[PDB]
Amino acid sequence: MTSTVEFINRWQRIALLSQSLLELAQRGEWDLLLQQEVSYLQSIETVMEKQTPPGITRSIQDMVAGYIKQTLDNEQLLKGLLQQRLDELSSLIGQSTRQKSLNNAYGRLSGMLLVPDAPGAS
């Protein structure tokens, strides 16, 4: 499950960075957001465009989805503070990539197991 550890480490990368950027933004350390900007955009797109691993458990599903939900809400408070727009900093695809991609991805993980077919929720 080395690819699954790497996958959880993908969503740890986004979760941890967005948490940092939340706290720092509230502290007025906007410079640190602008220095982490390209690092964060790099991270989030590397994660989205990287394939789902086979060896997932129920535990892994809830921790990954827990980190998706976490980074969505932290960075959403950021999005609202900055300009209210779902995409900010510099750009991903020029439009709200994050909302469409990570919320659909949440639904796919919750429905089948992160494949573009079955969306689900409890």
This structure was determined by NMR
**Would you call 52 exposed, middle or buried from its count of C-beta atoms within 10 A (0-12, 13-18, 19+)?**
middle
Cα separation, 50 vs 36, in Å, equals 21
Please give the DSSP secondary-structure letter assigned to residue 50: S
Q: Report yes or no: 52 and 115 within 8 Å, Cβ to Cβ.
A: yes
Q: Report yes or no: 40 and 70 within 8 Å, Cβ to Cβ.
A: no
CA angle (67 as vertex; 66, 69 as ends), nearest 5: 65
Cα separation, 24 vs 28, in Å, equals 6
Q: Can you give the C-alpha Rg of the chain in angstroms?
A: 14
Cα separation, 103 vs 97, in Å, equals 10
The tokens for 68 are: 């998706």
Nearby residues of 45 by Cβ (< 8 Å), 6 or more positions away = 92, 97
Domain ranges of the chain: 1-122
Q: Report yes or no: 5 and 57 within 8 Å, Cβ to Cβ.
A: no
